[PDB]
Design a protein around this motif. Structure first.
Motif, PDB file in Angstrom:
ATOM      1  N   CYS A 168      29.003  10.739  24.591  1.00  0.00           N
ATOM      2  CA  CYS A 168      30.421  11.078  24.905  1.00  0.00           C
ATOM      3  C   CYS A 168      30.879  10.323  26.150  1.00  0.00           C
TER       4      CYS A 168
ATOM      5  N   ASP B  33      26.965   9.943  15.584  1.00  0.00           N
ATOM      6  CA  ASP B  33      27.926  10.519  16.560  1.00  0.00           C
ATOM      7  C   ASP B  33      29.298   9.864  16.379  1.00  0.00           C
TER       8      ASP B  33
ATOM      9  N   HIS C 157      33.429  10.351  18.637  1.00  0.00           N
ATOM     10  CA  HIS C 157      34.448  11.054  19.455  1.00  0.00           C
ATOM     11  C   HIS C 157      35.833  10.575  19.029  1.00  0.00           C
TER      12      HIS C 157
ATOM     13  N   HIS D 166      34.274  16.062  19.457  1.00  0.00           N
ATOM     14  CA  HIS D 166      32.881  15.632  19.172  1.00  0.00           C
ATOM     15  C   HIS D 166      32.574  16.015  17.726  1.00  0.00           C
TER      16      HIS D 166
HETATM   17 ZN   LIG Z   1      29.875  14.253  22.217  1.00  0.00          ZN
END
Ligand SMILES: [Zn+2]
Ligand SMILES: C[C@@H](O)[C@H](N)C(=O)N[C@@H](CNC(=O)CCn1cnc2cc(Br)c(Cl)cc2c1=O)c1cccc(-c2ccccc2)c1
Ligand SMILES: C[C@@H](O)[C@H](N)C(=O)N[C@@H](CNC(=O)CCn1cnc2cc(Br)c(Cl)cc2c1=O)c1cccc(-c2ccccc2)c1
Ligand SMILES: [Zn+2]
Lengths: 400, 401
Positions: free
Chosen positions: A93, A142, A144, A270
């Motif tokens: 992040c 992942d 964002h 997220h």
């Molecule tokens: Zn994150």
């Protein structure tokens, strides 16, 4: 259905005490990992995500601004150089915000969807480590999303669709969904949490997804949706998370110029769907008991001769399959056809293409499955076309 | 100017900042270039019969002490601790490759075993010495280690040399300087072993008709080496490729195989990288092309645009067709002058700008402009797609003329 046993048997990976909870990926294991990455990349393109790569380490000073240092420093690996302390990234992040902060951002740039196969390290207790399931080093599917308050519902909607889309590929259709609501200690007004929880709730409703609350289990900085998939043994695996964050962008000086020409802090979402790529490979290994769908199989086809006489037909067919983009090997060893089939069956090779005199003379091939089924003798081009389709479609089902 | 730092910012490829000295943040378009370079290397790994593995990010200092690297290079290593145990963030991939080799019984039939990795390396380099993508703390090595017999060395060095020139020629690098470094004073093994090892490197180069100069006495303790320095269009020297023989590390890390005589034998190790640092090589390429990447490397290969809103559906259709052909393509249907659109995409170094007027829609054709400003005229859509596919798949340095 023990991924640690199957992992050793099919030479996928190994672990050593010199590197606790950090995977040595062997050729065949790394082939599965990379095909999983290719699959997630196709979804990133399909759902309009950027893909970035961040550094492994950043100044502790930056990590202190996130608030994570005070709460999770004991779970973080640290290293120093020239009187500066760096954290090995436990999360992607802060790195994603650093990329967002390069260049002036407009409302026109939002929603900005930034994905990464993020290499994360957690200083987890050595005694509690278990195969691919509980590790120190893992790769997160992942992303964002930086967006406006008004864009949250649409963006969470898209995340939910992506979750079910990706789980369905692997044959996971039983999904339990839980919405975690405002905890006792939280930032922002009761109004902010009303709207934030409502956004997650409406997004699930818009997708006709039934759910339940985990009351007061939300993070300090926003509510979340968690997705628990059930394997064929009916075992629960929490993999998917969609987490709203009204904290990190502000903390790391993230901003955009609004349509009203005022500077505004973006909302951060997220999300991980598979969660840990390593763990998800672990779950798939046990789900399929090493019988990976053809698109994931390290070796998809072994072409084999009955006697020396079909060696050159095997070579031509192996080249044809190679040209078709299929992961193929030739078994030209002076061994019984039975011995070859048994070995490649034990190695969980989806298809064994058997060439006897009858096959060579007719320009056909005899197709055997790792499930021990004889599909008979079929036209070479029709088999190749069918194998390509099964691989492209990422089908769970083999040829009939 | 052709500063990779300037082009990197201008084309949104990457950035670096003080909170992570000498470590790269790859933005969308830069990561696209990185991944295409990886795809290219993988195509060579398959052709030259290499396995591809992935090793852990960190390993116990105890193992790095066994290699001998700790005593010599501890100051250039990043270290971290857990449960009273010290770990080194890997500065090299060789020990990890040995760890994978040491898993499972190995025989002479398994050799040569060629083990490749896009290896994440970290070096605690002085922060004052860092610059751009050229001198960094965190890099990715196009690394491989070949485990082979003494007899197999010459053939494996031969294949390594062919792979080196194969890859350099793809990027238009034909000026390569080659240096063979021979036995130093303090060395392991017999004068006879060094005689054979030096000859294997020399004869491999001579048989490939590669002119080289000896660096007499400058070889490593553990074996001799060939180094390849390529020159860019500014005639600047870049040492990228190394073939290093190692008669030490396999013994040090208890590497063995069952010989034909059924007796345990230590394998010879060949260290080889060709690009060297992937990050550095991208920097070199960025300057070489001044951001005008060959079509196969170009972040966005084609932009399709309309003259009026009449052709907007035909543009969307053509855009989907190009995507299905495996081309990185975008539609530009914005209400802007054609001269404005073509300037934006030329500045972003898009190889091909496909324009759709009423004449193009009616004829099932498209007007093709190159970023250099050559008008190739109104051509058949399927002829253009096939020409673009061939240019990308052949990894051609040159565009349609
Ligand atoms: Zn994150
Ligand atoms: C999706 C990402 O963008 C997000 N940043 C993230 O990593 N979220 C966590 C779930 N979230 C949390 O776990 C928050 C609480 N938490 C816990 N442990 C930490 C440990 C460290 Br060392 C640090 Cl710095 C922070 C935290 C932290 O905030 C998450 C989500 C989905 C799967 C997994 C996961 C599942 C299995 C194995 C590994 C990882 C983890
Ligand atoms: C090809 C690999 O398998 C091999 N292990 C390796 O990395 N070799 C080095 C060149 N070799 C050396 O430089 C040997 C001396 N040396 C120097 N510095 C070190 C620093 C550390 Br922290 C450690 Cl642990 C070892 C060493 C070391 O052996 C090598 C070869 C080719 C390009 C590059 C390179 C070029 C530009 C940027 C980055 C890297 C480096
Ligand atoms: Zn090496």
């Amino acid at each position: 259905r023990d991924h640690r046993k199957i992992g050793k048997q099919l030479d996928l990976y190994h672990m050593q005490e010199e590197a606790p909870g950090m995977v040595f990926w062997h050729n065949d294991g790394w082939t599965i990992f990379r095909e999983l990455e290719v699959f997630v990349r196709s979804k990133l393109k399909e759902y309009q995500y950027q893909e970035v790569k961040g550094p492994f380490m950043m100044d502790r000073v930056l990590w202190e601004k996130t608030g994570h240092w005070d709460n999770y420093k004991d779970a973080m690996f640290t290293t120093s150089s020239e009187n500066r302390e760096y954290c090995i990234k436990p999360m992607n992040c802060p790195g994603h915000v650093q990329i967002f902060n390069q260049g002036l951002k407009s409302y026109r740039d939002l929603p900005l969807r930034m994905a990464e196969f993020g290499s994360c390290h957690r200083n987890e207790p050595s005694g509690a480590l278990h195969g691919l399931m509980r590790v120190r080093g893992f790769t997160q599917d992942d992303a964002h999303i930086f967006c406006t308050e008004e864009q949250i519902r649409d963006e969470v909607n898209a995340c939910i669709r992506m979750v079910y889309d990706m789980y369905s590929t692997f044959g996971f259709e039983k999904i339990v969904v839980k919405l975690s609501t405002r905890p006792d200690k939280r930032i922002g007004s009761d109004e902010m949490w009303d709207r934030a929880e409502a956004d997650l709730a409406v997004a699930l409703e818009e997708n006709n997804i039934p759910f339940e609350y985990q009351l007061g289990e939300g993070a300090f900085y926003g509510p979340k949706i968690e997705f628990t998939l059930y394997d064929c043994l009916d075992r629960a695996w929490q993999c998917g998370t969609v987490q709203l964050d009204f904290s990190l962008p502000s903390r790391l000086s993230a901003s955009y110029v609004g349509e009203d020409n005022e500077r505004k802090v973006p909302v951060m979402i997220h999300r991980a769907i598979l969660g840990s790529m390593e763990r998800f490979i672990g779950i798939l290994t046990e789900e399929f008991a090493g019988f990976f769908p053809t698109w994931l199989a390290p070796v998809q086809v072994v072409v084999m001769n009955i006697t020396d006489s079909q060696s050159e037909y095997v070579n031509e067919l192996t080249q044809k399959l190679q040209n078709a983009g299929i992961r193929v090997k030739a078994d030209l060893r002076n061994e019984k056809i039975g011995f070859k089939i048994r070995e490649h069956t034990l190695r969980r090779v989806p298809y064994m293409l058997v060439c006897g005199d009858k096959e060579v003379e007719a320009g056909k091939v005899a197709v055997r499955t790792r499930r021990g089924k004889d599909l008979g003798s079929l036209d070479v081009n029709d088999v190749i076309e069918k194998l390509q389709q099964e691989i492209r479609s990422r089908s769970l089902q083999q040829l009939e």
